[PDB]
Amino acid sequence: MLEAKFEEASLFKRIIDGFKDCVQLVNFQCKEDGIIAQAVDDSRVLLVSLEIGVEAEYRCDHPVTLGMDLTSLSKILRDTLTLIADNTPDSIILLFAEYSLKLMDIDADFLKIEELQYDSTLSLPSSEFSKIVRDLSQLSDSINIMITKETIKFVADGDIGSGSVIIKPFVDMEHPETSIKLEMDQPVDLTFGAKYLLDIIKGSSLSDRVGIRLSSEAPALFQFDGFLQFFLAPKFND
Amino acid sequence: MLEAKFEEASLFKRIIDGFKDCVQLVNFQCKEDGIIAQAVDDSRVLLVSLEIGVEAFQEYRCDHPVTLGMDLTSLSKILRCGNNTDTLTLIADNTPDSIILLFEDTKKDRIAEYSLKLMDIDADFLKIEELQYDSTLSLPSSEFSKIVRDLSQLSDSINIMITKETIKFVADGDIGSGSVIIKPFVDMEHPETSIKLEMDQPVDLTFGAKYLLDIIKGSSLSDRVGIRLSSEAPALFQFDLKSGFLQFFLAPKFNDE
Amino acid sequence: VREEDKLWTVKYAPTNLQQVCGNKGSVMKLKNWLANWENSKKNSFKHAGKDGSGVFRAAMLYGPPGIGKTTAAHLVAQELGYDILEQNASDVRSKTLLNAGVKNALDNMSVVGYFKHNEEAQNLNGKHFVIIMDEVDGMSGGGVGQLAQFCRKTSTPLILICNERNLPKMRPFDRVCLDIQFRRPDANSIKSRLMTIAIREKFKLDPNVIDRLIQTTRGDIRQVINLLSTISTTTKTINHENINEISKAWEKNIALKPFDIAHKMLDGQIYSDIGSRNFTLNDKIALYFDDFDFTPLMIQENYLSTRPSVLKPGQSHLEAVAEAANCISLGDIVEKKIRSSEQLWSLLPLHAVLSSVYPASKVAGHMAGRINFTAWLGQNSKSAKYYRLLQEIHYHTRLGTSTDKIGLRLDYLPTFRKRLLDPFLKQGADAISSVIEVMDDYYLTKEDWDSIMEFFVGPDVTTAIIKKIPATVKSGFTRKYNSMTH
Amino acid sequence: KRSKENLPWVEKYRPETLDEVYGQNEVITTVRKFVDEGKLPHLLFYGPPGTGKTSTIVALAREIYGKNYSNMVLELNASDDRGIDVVRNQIKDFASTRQIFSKGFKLIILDEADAMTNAAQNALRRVIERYTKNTRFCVLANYAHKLTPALLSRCTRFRFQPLPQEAIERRIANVLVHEKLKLSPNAEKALIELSNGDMRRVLNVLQSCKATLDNPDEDEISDDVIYECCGAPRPSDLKAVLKSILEDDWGTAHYTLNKVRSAKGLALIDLIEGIVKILEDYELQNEETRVHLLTKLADIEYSISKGGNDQIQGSAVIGAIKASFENET
Amino acid sequence: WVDKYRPKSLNALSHNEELTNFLKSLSDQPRDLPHLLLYGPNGTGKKTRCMALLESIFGPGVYRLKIDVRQFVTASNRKLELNVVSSPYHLEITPSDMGNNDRIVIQELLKEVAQMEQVDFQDGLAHRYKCVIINEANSLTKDAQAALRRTMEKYSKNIRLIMVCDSMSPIIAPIKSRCLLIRCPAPSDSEISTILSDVVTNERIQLETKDILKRIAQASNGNLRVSLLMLESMALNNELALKSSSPIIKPDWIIVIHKLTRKIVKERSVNSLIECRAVLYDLLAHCIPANIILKELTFSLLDVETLNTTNKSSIIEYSSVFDERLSLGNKAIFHLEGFIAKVMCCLD
Numbered sequence A: 001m002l003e004a005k006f007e008e009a010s011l012f013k014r015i016i017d018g019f020k021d022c023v024q025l026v027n028f029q030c031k032e033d034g035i036i037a038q039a040v041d042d043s044r045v046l047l048v049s050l051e052i053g054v055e056a057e058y059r060c061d062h063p064v065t066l067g068m069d070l071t072s073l074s075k076i077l078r079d080t081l082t083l084i085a086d087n088t089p090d091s092i093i094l095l096f097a098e099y100s101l102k103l104m105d106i107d108a109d110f111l112k113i114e115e116l117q118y119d120s121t122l123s124l125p126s127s128e129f130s131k132i133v134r135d136l137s138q139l140s141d142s143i144n145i146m147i148t149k150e151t152i153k154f155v156a157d158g159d160i161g162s163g164s165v166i167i168k169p170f171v172d173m174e175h176p177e178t179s180i181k182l183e184m185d186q187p188v189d190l191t192f193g194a195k196y197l198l199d200i201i202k203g204s205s206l207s208d209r210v211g212i213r214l215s216s217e218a219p220a221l222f223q224f225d226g227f228l229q230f231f232l233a234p235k236f237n238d
Numbered sequence B: 001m002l003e004a005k006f007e008e009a010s011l012f013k014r015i016i017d018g019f020k021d022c023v024q025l026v027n028f029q030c031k032e033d034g035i036i037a038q039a040v041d042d043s044r045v046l047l048v049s050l051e052i053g054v055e056a057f058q059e060y061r062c063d064h065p066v067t068l069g070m071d072l073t074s075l076s077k078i079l080r081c082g083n084n085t086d087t088l089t090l091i092a093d094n095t096p097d098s099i100i101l102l103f104e105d106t107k108k109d110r111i112a113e114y115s116l117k118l119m120d121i122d123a124d125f126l127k128i129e130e131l132q133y134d135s136t137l138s139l140p141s142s143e144f145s146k147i148v149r150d151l152s153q154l155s156d157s158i159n160i161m162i163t164k165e166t167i168k169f170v171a172d173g174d175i176g177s178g179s180v181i182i183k184p185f186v187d188m189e190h191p192e193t194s195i196k197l198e199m200d201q202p203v204d205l206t207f208g209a210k211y212l213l214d215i216i217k218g219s220s221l222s223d224r225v226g227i228r229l230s231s232e233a234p235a236l237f238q239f240d241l242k243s244g245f246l247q248f249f250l251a252p253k254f255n256d257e
Numbered sequence C: 001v002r003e004e005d006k007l008w009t010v011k012y013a014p015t016n017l018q019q020v021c022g023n024k025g026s027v028m029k030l031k032n033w034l035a036n037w038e039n040s041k042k043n044s045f046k047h048a049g050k051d052g053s054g055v056f057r058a059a060m061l062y063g064p065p066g067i068g069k070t071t072a073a074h075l076v077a078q079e080l081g082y083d084i085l086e087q088n089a090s091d092v093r094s095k096t097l098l099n100a101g102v103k104n105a106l107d108n109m110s111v112v113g114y115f116k117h118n119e120e121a122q123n124l125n126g127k128h129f130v131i132i133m134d135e136v137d138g139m140s141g142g143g144v145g146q147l148a149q150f151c152r153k154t155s156t157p158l159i160l161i162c163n164e165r166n167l168p169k170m171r172p173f174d175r176v177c178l179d180i181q182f183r184r185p186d187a188n189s190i191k192s193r194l195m196t197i198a199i200r201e202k203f204k205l206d207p208n209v210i211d212r213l214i215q216t217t218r219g220d221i222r223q224v225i226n227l228l229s230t231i232s233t234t235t236k237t238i239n240h241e242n243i244n245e246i247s248k249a250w251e252k253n254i255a256l257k258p259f260d261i262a263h264k265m266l267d268g269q270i271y272s273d274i275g276s277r278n279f280t281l282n283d284k285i286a287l288y289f290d291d292f293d294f295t296p297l298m299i300q301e302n303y304l305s306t307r308p309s310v311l312k313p314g315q316s317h318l319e320a321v322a323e324a325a326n327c328i329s330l331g332d333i334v335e336k337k338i339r340s341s342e343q344l345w346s347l348l349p350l351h352a353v354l355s356s357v358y359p360a361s362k363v364a365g366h367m368a369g370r371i372n373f374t375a376w377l378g379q380n381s382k383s384a385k386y387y388r389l390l391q392e393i394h395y396h397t398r399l400g401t402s403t404d405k406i407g408l409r410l411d412y413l414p415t416f417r418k419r420l421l422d423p424f425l426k427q428g429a430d431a432i433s434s435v436i437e438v439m440d441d442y443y444l445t446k447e448d449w450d451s452i453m454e455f456f457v458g459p460d461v462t463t464a465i466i467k468k469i470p471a472t473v474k475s476g477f478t479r480k481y482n483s484m485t486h
Numbered sequence D: 001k002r003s004k005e006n007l008p009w010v011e012k013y014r015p016e017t018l019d020e021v022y023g024q025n026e027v028i029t030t031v032r033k034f035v036d037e038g039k040l041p042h043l044l045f046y047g048p049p050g051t052g053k054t055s056t057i058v059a060l061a062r063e064i065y066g067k068n069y070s071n072m073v074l075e076l077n078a079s080d081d082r083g084i085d086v087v088r089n090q091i092k093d094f095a096s097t098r099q100i101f102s103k104g105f106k107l108i109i110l111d112e113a114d115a116m117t118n119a120a121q122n123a124l125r126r127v128i129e130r131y132t133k134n135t136r137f138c139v140l141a142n143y144a145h146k147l148t149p150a151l152l153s154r155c156t157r158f159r160f161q162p163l164p165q166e167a168i169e170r171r172i173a174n175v176l177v178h179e180k181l182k183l184s185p186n187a188e189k190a191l192i193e194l195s196n197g198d199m200r201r202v203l204n205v206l207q208s209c210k211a212t213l214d215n216p217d218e219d220e221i222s223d224d225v226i227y228e229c230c231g232a233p234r235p236s237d238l239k240a241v242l243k244s245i246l247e248d249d250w251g252t253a254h255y256t257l258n259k260v261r262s263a264k265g266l267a268l269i270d271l272i273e274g275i276v277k278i279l280e281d282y283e284l285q286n287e288e289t290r291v292h293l294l295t296k297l298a299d300i301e302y303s304i305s306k307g308g309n310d311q312i313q314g315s316a317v318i319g320a321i322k323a324s325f326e327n328e329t
Numbered sequence E: 001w002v003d004k005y006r007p008k009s010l011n012a013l014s015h016n017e018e019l020t021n022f023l024k025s026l027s028d029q030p031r032d033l034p035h036l037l038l039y040g041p042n043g044t045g046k047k048t049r050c051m052a053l054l055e056s057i058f059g060p061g062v063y064r065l066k067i068d069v070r071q072f073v074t075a076s077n078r079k080l081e082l083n084v085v086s087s088p089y090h091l092e093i094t095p096s097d098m099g100n101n102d103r104i105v106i107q108e109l110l111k112e113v114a115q116m117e118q119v120d121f122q123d124g125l126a127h128r129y130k131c132v133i134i135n136e137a138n139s140l141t142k143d144a145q146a147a148l149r150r151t152m153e154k155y156s157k158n159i160r161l162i163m164v165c166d167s168m169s170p171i172i173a174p175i176k177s178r179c180l181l182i183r184c185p186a187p188s189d190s191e192i193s194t195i196l197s198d199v200v201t202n203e204r205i206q207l208e209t210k211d212i213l214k215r216i217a218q219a220s221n222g223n224l225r226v227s228l229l230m231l232e233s234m235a236l237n238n239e240l241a242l243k244s245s246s247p248i249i250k251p252d253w254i255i256v257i258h259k260l261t262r263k264i265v266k267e268r269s270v271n272s273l274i275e276c277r278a279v280l281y282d283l284l285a286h287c288i289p290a291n292i293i294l295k296e297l298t299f300s301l302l303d304v305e306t307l308n309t310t311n312k313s314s315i316i317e318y319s320s321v322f323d324e325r326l327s328l329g330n331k332a333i334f335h336l337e338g339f340i341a342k343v344m345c346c347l348d
């Protein structure tokens, strides 16, 4: 017996337009804390984890798991919202109007979300990162991130040429949004697919800045502050 | 080595936008005098020739004459991914290799270093503009653009006729015809609207409409287009820049009659 | 204005219905239909006339070219005082532009007719529209669908004119509108017109050559008029002394249809010793080149449905059919190699000889029945429709079957029939509990149960056994399935 | 770094002028007289691969205009798009205007026009003759059936015969002059017979045998070096294998075939061609022998073209030869 | 039942002990297992042995599969869709689904899975190679085969290709060479009878003696899956009571082919050829491979006893010819009708 209420459609519409492209089936769980959604990609390369706080009405008697497709939600949300579901939620109802959606059986094993140690943790505004990705994706199809000596470097070696943008930590007081923070302990250098970042950057409208977490052998973490964590697997070698 | 630091960023963008979709492969020659370039169209009908001195550059350093061939599509791709508020620097090593375009903001440290692999274009450097033209004229770019894009809707050929103190643009097609006749006159209050004409012999010759529509795209650089016409000679359409000039050499269409 | 500059076909065009030579019955029926259209509209078109014509709102004209279809459609509308609205191929016709321009003129009144003549009472239908859609065949730019939809929601006489009726694109016009067939006229109808033209132009015409003139140009009177006009400039005497050159130089090279191409290539008269030099092999290959999309299919369809006449001594019909089928297989191999990669189009005439010419020549004779339509086009569509269902069933059962889409149809379905269907026969409506515990195991639904039964062939035919079980168990099974949750 | 000596021998010895084009004397003479008299109609060169067509037309373009030929001459090879939308815009605009540098007739070289769609050739059919007093077309081709009859008729047909022995010998002598090297007469005859008219294969195998000398300044290229560089079977063991197949029994013939084809690593596809060329000279006193001898060998060659097996096909060749050489007795 | 009683490891394979020992040998050093190609008769138990070796080298959690949908696009706008049977240690593809677009599917999906790597928790990314299973590899197109053969050595430390197929002949020589070839012989009668005995003692079916299982094994021609399925159908029809007098249930298409052979041998005329073409249409329209139809028809024709030696010899010759012609064409009826006409001309 779950019921959640959002005062405006924009808060949910932004996140749905954010993560509807990559994964189509994501399993939600509702408890006394919030909505914890988890999903894995088709090739086990991009693991998505959504964390929605209840502060955005909430009532859940017991933590229960649900599954719903994002495409129909995107079509119907093209004015407060309320999502309701009853025991054994085979049908989820949404009131703006009434919209009933069916649940799909998903065999997604709930995996734990760990806060391990990271060799580098940085934070940079979302619009600049999105522009950098859209600019480096035109050259090649693989973006290399190298964090060395308090300097970030995005490299893209294509066929017509090679681009390389380097950034140093900068802080500002007149505009607190245009600030680049960084914490480093070890020089790292990894490569990621361009068509993954090209859709990861589509969530630039939900927040102002993005956190990038890099480790030696662990996948990269892209964090958007509703919380959204993308675990992206790099390329092995060569 | 070769280091050319511009004063602004959108200058090179506007300069390339003149012949963006007109030529595909160019070859910049950099010397102590400045950057020169000349490129032939795909159909070998018109030639774009650009000369930019050391006046538009904030800094210029070139020891020996270097040649750098490149396509315009990738060059426009590189110029588009740069913000119009940075400072642009062209960098070339000792031997001619991948040219380095570097964007550096003036307030925050943003180093955007893009590479562009050179093409191996045959260095058939051409020497035109030493031929005495029969007729020379100059008129505002807006009027020329209006006349040409109005006459292009009636046909595909445009006959330019320079007669005694008369300029005549004639379009003859299938649905109808059109004739725009202007006369030289100079104003004192507005020296830029004046149309100047210096002739020695009356000259009548035809051109295509597509090439004229592609040439008039360069009207966003200057405001006074110069036209040099001569029998058995390519027509010269010159746009005067603040440091150099951009000139199109168009080939006239012969008449079967 | 001028009278001589005319093209000999507009100065001599019929200005009244009593001048349209040929097909009196068809034009008379159409005239009666256009006359009684108002009376049938009074009865909401729900009362068939004497000839069963008042139940159709729209008329259809089809027949060989150059017979007077447009001429008749114009004269019949001009005689009854109507107003003529004519759209043709030159105008842009599409569902958008058709619903834009002529849809408003479907139920409106004439604006020019009101000023034509209203002082005297000639007729009450002098202010209405008759929309003539000419050359419906050419719709290269809602060509046939929207026009067929106009045939039901119309309020004015709608006359449509085409050239060939049985073409697959214009099938919707089958029963939505009345159609009439205009035939190739004989040599007795146009003979008076031709003699009157010869009298009015000071040039001789023997009444004996007009039949040959009509024969060389099968049914196009306009072609006869143009032939006479073109030759009357230098020669004014057309008789039996030079008719052979005219008939040989002015032949009509019409394109042959799948029925006619088969009837011609299967005739045992061409492959004889005399016909081999009157209709050479180059013409036989050009016959294929007229339509390389249906000729091999037609030949493969009806190569063994004829009685040959070129059977070599000793060779029976079965051996000739076997050789024809061998050459058919070789032509199929050549066709697959042509339409494969590398786009080998220079191999077309070899396919023309192997697929069409050789099997025809091997079994060439007199056809017993009629030219049957090809059956492979429908069989391939049915096979694809069945393969889609088989793939769906296989990917539904993939979690448990662990078998390809091929090994399932050949093996699994026989036992699935016993498991699923048989309890409904031997046990009745109390086996509903067991059957379901099967399909939920393989993630099936009612839609998969509807499709699985249709696959069996031979002795096991389920499309008849399904109609044997009571209907109450049918109505209970779907309810029991929709009620329970998976 | 970059110089004329780095180019391969296929291109390093490209004829600069018409004087360095041997063999096709009866066409070079006519072309030179054309350009001398002043008239040059639409040309259509048709010849086997590697004969001198492109070199001849480039030398002609250099002779007509100047040392800068690729300035006022348009050239549409198979590397550029030549659809109907190209012959509409580009070729027509080039043929409808004047030159930029001098005052003369323009030249358009459609190289390898056999790779053009029928619609493109049909569109070119009228623009090739509408503007005649200003431009000239030169159509180079290897297969004279891809061109439509109309376009084929509008152009003067010039066939490029394969290079005779004297022309290839002169070219070999000229190459041996510029490059310090010595070549044996029997090696020269073997190279000529292996050329099959191809001037490119000559230079290729010549560079190969020069590289396989370990000192290309003193030792002469013998026939064995040439036969080893391309792996072609020597006439000696070829005739030996043919004799052993024709005369000896099955076991020893198969043994000697497997011993010859494994002594130098020969290929059955070359052995078949060599045996056919050697055996075409025999005087068979019947017609049924040659029929089977050709049919079975062609079938075996087509099967080798797909690479089924390696020894079954050899025994098949042996059996075909033996069964064909049986109606004689 | 077919799906119920199936071994799920290498210690449970109960036939062809030599092949099981060879698989155990190949499962000792997993990090050096080359590409594999299984070939043998149909329904021999190739996929089960493949998934058993895959469980022996990986963990036991390889059997939990899930179906996913992948959408590709060709050069044109025609969008194609494929199903992928994925597991946290491997993925199975059936590229034979797409008609002539297999070259796109292979060169796209295999490259995609080869470039990147696998991450999952069950010490965050370090794992071994990923396995790709290809069912019905014999139906692969030649260009797709070339793409698959080239995407083998470039990225070898990530992808191990284990393909399975019956009638290995339509496999190009490079693929045949650059991978290991493992044969899967059909189990003997003494072993399929033991399989049936285990099934009947586990499922509690009432049988009189052991002759019924022997007859079933003899009828199945060696095919284990078809034998198990026929046994289950016999148990279903016989109402939980197997007796020594039970009609062997041949599938419907087998009976259709037998009636077709009877019609062929009885009446040799073109009028019978028309009904033959109708029967072939009805058979092909219901998702039956033409090569299987040809094989069954020819073997049932040779089964006919009223024909002498020369007739059967010419029949087998024409069958070989039209079978060669069948793999080089698309319209299969065009070849089947020709073969029927040829056998009719041969018989008389």
Ligand SMILES: Nc1ncnc2c1ncn2[C@@H]1O[C@H](COP(=O)(O)OP(=O)(O)OP(O)(O)=S)[C@@H](O)[C@H]1O
Binding pocket: C008, C009, C010, C012, C013, C014, C019, C020, C021, C022, C064, C065, C066, C067, C068, C069, C070, C071, C072, C163, C193, C221, C222
């Ligand atoms: N029966 C006829 N009597 C006299 N003239 C006729 C007759 N049929 C046709 N014509 C002449 O043919 C011309 C009219 O052409 P139509 O036959 O009406 O063309 P059509 O019937 O619409 O066939 P299409 O549209 O070309 S396929 C005029 O010159 C008429 O004089």
Ligand SMILES: Nc1ncnc2c1ncn2[C@@H]1O[C@H](COP(=O)(O)OP(=O)(O)OP(O)(O)=S)[C@@H](O)[C@H]1O
Binding pocket: D009, D010, D011, D013, D014, D015, D020, D021, D022, D023, D024, D048, D049, D050, D051, D052, D053, D054, D055, D056, D142, D171, D199, D200
């Ligand atoms: N007649 C010739 N005389 C001397 N060298 C020749 C001759 N023909 C060909 N060659 C050599 O072969 C090279 C290539 O010849 P090309 O003329 O380019 O071949 P081609 O005529 O274009 O035939 P294609 O284009 O391959 S079908 C030249 O650079 C020469 O080295």
Ligand SMILES: Nc1ncnc2c1ncn2[C@@H]1O[C@H](COP(=O)(O)OP(=O)(O)O)[C@@H](O)[C@H]1O
Binding pocket: C402, C403, E001, E002, E003, E005, E006, E007, E012, E013, E014, E015, E041, E042, E043, E044, E045, E046, E047, E048, E049, E195, E224, E225, E228
């Ligand atoms: N060792 C075995 N013990 C018991 N059953 C077996 C064994 N090997 C194979 N099978 C049977 O084979 C069936 C699966 O056959 P399958 O592997 O799909 O054939 P194919 O190899 O042609 O795909 C299973 O139902 C299983 O019962």
Ligand SMILES: [Mg+2]
Binding pocket: C069, C070, C134, C135, C161
């Ligand atoms: Mg008409």
Ligand SMILES: [Mg+2]
Binding pocket: D053, D054, D111, D112, D140
């Ligand atoms: Mg060439």
